[PDB]
Design a protein around this nucleic acid. Sequence first.
RNA 1: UGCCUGGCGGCCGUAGCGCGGUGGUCCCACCUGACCCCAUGCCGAACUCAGAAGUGAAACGCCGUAGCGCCGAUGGUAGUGUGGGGUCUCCCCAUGCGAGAGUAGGGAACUGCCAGGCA
RNA 2: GCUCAACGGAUAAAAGGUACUCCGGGGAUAACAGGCUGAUACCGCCCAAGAGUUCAUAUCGACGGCGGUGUUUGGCACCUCGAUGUCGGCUCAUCACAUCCUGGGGCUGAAGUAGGUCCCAAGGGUAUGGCUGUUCGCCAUUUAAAGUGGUACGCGAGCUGGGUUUAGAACGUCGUGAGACAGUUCGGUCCCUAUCUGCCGUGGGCGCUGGAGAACUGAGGGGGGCUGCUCCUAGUACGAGA
RNA 3: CCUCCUAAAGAGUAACGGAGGAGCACGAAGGUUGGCUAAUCCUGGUCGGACAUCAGGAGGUUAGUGCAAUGGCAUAAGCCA
RNA 4: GGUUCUCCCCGAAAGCUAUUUAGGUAGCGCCUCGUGAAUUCAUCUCCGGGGGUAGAGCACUGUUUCGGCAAGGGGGUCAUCCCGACUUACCAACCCGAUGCAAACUGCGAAUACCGGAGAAUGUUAUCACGGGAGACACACGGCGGGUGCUAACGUCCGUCGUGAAGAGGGAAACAACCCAGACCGCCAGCUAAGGUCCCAAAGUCAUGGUUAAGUGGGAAACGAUGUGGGAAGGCCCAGACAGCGUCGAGUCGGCCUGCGCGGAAGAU
Lengths: 77, 93, 136
Amino acid sequence: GSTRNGRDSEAKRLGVKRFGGESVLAGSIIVRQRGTKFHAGANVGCGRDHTLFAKADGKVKFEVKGPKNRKFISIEA
Amino acid sequence: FTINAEVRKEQGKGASRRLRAANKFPAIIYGGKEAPLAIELDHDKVMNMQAKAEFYSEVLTIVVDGKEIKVKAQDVQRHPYKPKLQHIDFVRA
Amino acid sequence: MLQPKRTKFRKMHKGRNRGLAQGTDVSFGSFGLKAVGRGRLTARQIEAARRAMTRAVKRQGKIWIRVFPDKPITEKPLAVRMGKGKGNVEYWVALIQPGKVLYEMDGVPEELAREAFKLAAAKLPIKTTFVTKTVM
RNA sequence: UGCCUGGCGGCCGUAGCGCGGUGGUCCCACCUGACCCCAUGCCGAACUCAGAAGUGAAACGCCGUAGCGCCGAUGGUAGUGUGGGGUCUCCCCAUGCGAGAGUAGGGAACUGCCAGGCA
RNA sequence: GCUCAACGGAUAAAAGGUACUCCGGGGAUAACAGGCUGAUACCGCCCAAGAGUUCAUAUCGACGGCGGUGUUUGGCACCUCGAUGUCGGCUCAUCACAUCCUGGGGCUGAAGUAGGUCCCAAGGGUAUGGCUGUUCGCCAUUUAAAGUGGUACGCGAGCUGGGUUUAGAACGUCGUGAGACAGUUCGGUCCCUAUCUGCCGUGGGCGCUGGAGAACUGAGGGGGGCUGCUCCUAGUACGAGA
RNA sequence: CCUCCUAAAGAGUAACGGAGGAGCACGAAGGUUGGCUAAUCCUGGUCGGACAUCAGGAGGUUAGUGCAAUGGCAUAAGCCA
RNA sequence: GGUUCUCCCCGAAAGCUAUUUAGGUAGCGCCUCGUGAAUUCAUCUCCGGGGGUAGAGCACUGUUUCGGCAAGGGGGUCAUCCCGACUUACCAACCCGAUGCAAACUGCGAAUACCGGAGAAUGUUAUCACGGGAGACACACGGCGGGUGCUAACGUCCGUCGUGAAGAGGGAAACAACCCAGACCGCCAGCUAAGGUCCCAAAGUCAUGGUUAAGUGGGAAACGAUGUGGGAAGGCCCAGACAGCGUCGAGUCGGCCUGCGCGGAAGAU
Ligand SMILES: C=C[C@]1(C)C[C@@H](OC(=O)CS[C@H]2C[C@H]3CC[C@@H](C2)N3C)[C@]2(C)[C@H](C)CC[C@]3(CCC(=O)[C@H]32)[C@@H](C)[C@@H]1O
Ligand SMILES: [K+]
Ligand SMILES: [K+]
Ligand SMILES: [K+]
Ligand SMILES: [K+]
Ligand SMILES: [K+]
Ligand SMILES: [K+]
Ligand SMILES: [K+]
Ligand SMILES: [K+]
Ligand SMILES: [K+]
Ligand SMILES: [K+]
Ligand SMILES: [K+]
Ligand SMILES: [K+]
Ligand SMILES: [K+]
Ligand SMILES: [K+]
Ligand SMILES: [K+]
Ligand SMILES: [K+]
Ligand SMILES: [K+]
Ligand SMILES: [K+]
Ligand SMILES: [K+]
Ligand SMILES: [K+]
Ligand SMILES: [Mg+2]
Ligand SMILES: [Mg+2]
Ligand SMILES: [Mg+2]
Ligand SMILES: [Mg+2]
Ligand SMILES: [Mg+2]
Ligand SMILES: [Mg+2]
Ligand SMILES: [Mg+2]
Ligand SMILES: [Mg+2]
Ligand SMILES: [Mg+2]
Ligand SMILES: [Mg+2]
Ligand SMILES: [Mg+2]
Ligand SMILES: [Mg+2]
Ligand SMILES: [Mg+2]
Ligand SMILES: [Mg+2]
Ligand SMILES: [Mg+2]
Ligand SMILES: [Mg+2]
Ligand SMILES: [Mg+2]
Ligand SMILES: [Mg+2]
Ligand SMILES: [Mg+2]
Ligand SMILES: [Mg+2]
Ligand SMILES: [Mg+2]
Ligand SMILES: [Mg+2]
Ligand SMILES: [Mg+2]
Ligand SMILES: [Mg+2]
Ligand SMILES: [Mg+2]
Ligand SMILES: [Mg+2]
Ligand SMILES: [Mg+2]
Ligand SMILES: [Mg+2]
Ligand SMILES: [Mg+2]
Ligand SMILES: [Mg+2]
Ligand SMILES: [Mg+2]
Ligand SMILES: [Mg+2]
Ligand SMILES: [Mg+2]
Ligand SMILES: [Mg+2]
Ligand SMILES: [Mg+2]
Ligand SMILES: [Mg+2]
Ligand SMILES: [Mg+2]
Ligand SMILES: [Mg+2]
Ligand SMILES: [Mg+2]
Ligand SMILES: [Mg+2]
Ligand SMILES: [Mg+2]
Ligand SMILES: [Mg+2]
Ligand SMILES: [Mg+2]
Ligand SMILES: [Mg+2]
Ligand SMILES: [Mg+2]
Ligand SMILES: [Mg+2]
Ligand SMILES: [Mg+2]
Ligand SMILES: [Mg+2]
């Protein structure tokens, strides 16, 4: 007859906006994410929704770093 | 047990499936400090002798390139359902 | 007949049944009945085949069932249209790939294992083959 | 220049555990007391201060040792892009890419800066 | 200051009935039939637990397995909404064979008689009545038998119009009500002069090689093909008898 | 409106597909500084039991997160002032 | 519903979002015309990236079977003030070792795809922006990946490519959507594609080696069977095997793998 499902939320367009080696202007969003899947490295800020954004003009650099092998995003300015 | 073998020219999936589509099968000899030797074996010959439980326990001689390599049977990949051998690992004794 | 005692979810996507089996060796007993074909074994079929081979051995030796029917299969009732939600779970199946050892047996002669498994095989929708434990 | 110790890094398990040693001159640790500075939702346990009689017991560092964790080929297998084929619910062939698991094996980290002890 | 929640929010402010109906449209979309499908249905088969004194396989076939048909209930919405007339009956059929009878046969837990079951076989044959709109079904009484299906659930430009399904009316029921019910009840317009195809008959033309009158041959086609009972064989074979 | 899956390893992606949530809460549950580290079990211990609190050990986040799910979180985003 | 002369050039869409919207309409996407501008864009190679799919795996979340170990717990005597002690058709968690399974599992993890950079060659700027004009927002089938349905439907709903739509020609008997291939016009020239070459009907009654005896080819499964071909390996055998009746003098026996056939196989003009 009827079903109790049939709901879903709008897709949030998360994920990587600027990949490795891409030249960005300061302020450019590099990744939108839920929590810190990626962490802010050098010249990268972490917004209130865990958005990583460039704090300097330069090139995006993904790196695995530290004792937990966490993924950091940096900007090579 | 004495197995005759040739050095495999070609490796990979295509080469290996062509071997088995001609009643041969790939094998590998490794161990010691020499480089692994990738060999091809006659299927029916080896399948017949590996029926015996002695094949897997005792040292075997692979006559490859006319040279005697003493080996133990280390691993065998069997065909999933048919009574055939896909591959054997031999370790240099 | 076999069925998961619990599941996280009631209903499962149809899925596909590609690939060759994992669990291709007689790992427990001496003798095994192996799938050559591909398909679904229902819990009723697994039970029918189990009862056949068990009766053949006259409760002797030991029997393992290597497959478990953990996939729920839904059906729509008769005279209902398409849509209006997924159908109700009616039975459970194990997906079988070629090479899957279905049953194993120990503590009988080979002759009797072969007969017991022949009687079991006649209950199953998939082509099977008798297999023996290999040294490697 | 070597050996030891402390601090700060690189690196992030071949680097971690376990198990057997081993070190007190110096350093480190525990330690010794607390009207003090400061502290305990109680307690000088911790934090903190004033110290140097004692011990390396614990910890810590170092060394040894595969029982582990960890790393890990080769080959084969699985998958798969393109083209083609079949008996097309699934496969196969040509070509390119090629795991995961497992196997042999590796493996008891290595390294920069500064300071101090000793030789 | 908004459950403007029908959440891009027609108005500050809004429910129903129509079988008394009407228009514009749609096979974009249902009801019939066709189609695709074959879950379901029906019919085969495989395995053989077991029932059958004993004995799986005379007969039956648990648990399971594999098909076939298009054949029920359905699924889908492809054809038809500038109309593809519908249940049942009547008339007239025609095909399939999964055979009801009659014919041939194997096995039988087949003495005989008479069955059971399976195989072959489609030539022909294959009830009348009571009740009900019925098909069906039950019942009565026949029959060698009263086959099962397909054919637009064969057949309304062939008939009927009892049923379904307009407008009238009533009951039960639902509704405040209009009205409504795949509840019931009584009443209630069935058109077509056949062009073409087809079919049944019947002529005219020309042909068939000079014309004409007859008698033929037989390629080919069609029709037909059912069966009871009694007696004899013989109260024999068979049977303890019956 | 939110979360997951379907969704084919960027984004997005349908069905009367499969599962759950929201229409708030909070002047602290916000800011910052300083500090702290979980579940669970074993051994012992007034009442006290399977489970209270205490002590030690094992364990190492298997806890926690104002409320779904996912992704996060020890430098904690968790806990206290 | 209908919309009237001609030729030339380009050439869609049947999607998204919203809608008292759903066969309507609007913005965007896609078409056209114009203007303007960067190697602007595409292919390939190389380089920098993230990934969590396929596959795999089982530490985690769940599920699963077997074995071991056994904390405890039922089922019950003897005891019974309070207790205990043997004891089980026994049911058994944790842990340990083995085995699988997962869309909403992941201590792993491709191919592809995608984003960015660089470099050639090639391409009628193929790109982007702005402006004039639209149409379209019923799609269909086929391939691949899936949800749904019965891995039913010429079913339904997505993703992605192809074709039809809007595409003739050749092939598939006939047959939008399959295969080959993109028709500017003319030719009684030639070469090919898919597909074919005995006759209908253009081209081999072509060559060589095999298989089949079923008209299989030219419909149908489980399953059944000394059909028949090939391959590897055995048992027994002139110390006489196998079958028939010690005799008899040569092979015999039945599993394995595989090629092609056979039964299984009933429908209506
Ligand atoms: C008028 C249509 C009729 C004569 C009858 C029709 O039946 C119906 O449509 C049932 S509704 C019924 C029809 C007529 C007209 C009004 C009233 C209601 N009633 C007297 C009926 C049986 C079908 C169900 C639909 C298709 C039809 C063609 C074939 C068929 O069997 C017909 C149509 C195309 C036909 O013209
Ligand atoms: K950006
Ligand atoms: K609305
Ligand atoms: K009205
Ligand atoms: K049959
Ligand atoms: K019998
Ligand atoms: K109509
Ligand atoms: K008839
Ligand atoms: K008979
Ligand atoms: K007949
Ligand atoms: K009709
Ligand atoms: K009629
Ligand atoms: K007519
Ligand atoms: K008439
Ligand atoms: K006509
Ligand atoms: K605060
Ligand atoms: K529009
Ligand atoms: K334009
Ligand atoms: K498609
Ligand atoms: K085209
Ligand atoms: K034929
Ligand atoms: Mg989401
Ligand atoms: Mg880190
Ligand atoms: Mg390949
Ligand atoms: Mg102190
Ligand atoms: Mg010490
Ligand atoms: Mg690997
Ligand atoms: Mg160590
Ligand atoms: Mg709205
Ligand atoms: Mg009208
Ligand atoms: Mg239609
Ligand atoms: Mg219909
Ligand atoms: Mg139908
Ligand atoms: Mg449709
Ligand atoms: Mg029609
Ligand atoms: Mg008309
Ligand atoms: Mg017949
Ligand atoms: Mg006839
Ligand atoms: Mg005759
Ligand atoms: Mg009658
Ligand atoms: Mg009719
Ligand atoms: Mg009829
Ligand atoms: Mg009339
Ligand atoms: Mg008529
Ligand atoms: Mg009437
Ligand atoms: Mg009335
Ligand atoms: Mg006749
Ligand atoms: Mg995505
Ligand atoms: Mg993708
Ligand atoms: Mg789309
Ligand atoms: Mg805070
Ligand atoms: Mg053009
Ligand atoms: Mg509105
Ligand atoms: Mg998978
Ligand atoms: Mg629309
Ligand atoms: Mg649309
Ligand atoms: Mg579509
Ligand atoms: Mg598909
Ligand atoms: Mg369709
Ligand atoms: Mg389909
Ligand atoms: Mg059109
Ligand atoms: Mg065409
Ligand atoms: Mg054509
Ligand atoms: Mg043609
Ligand atoms: Mg030519
Ligand atoms: Mg010719
Ligand atoms: Mg010839
Ligand atoms: Mg044929
Ligand atoms: Mg056949």
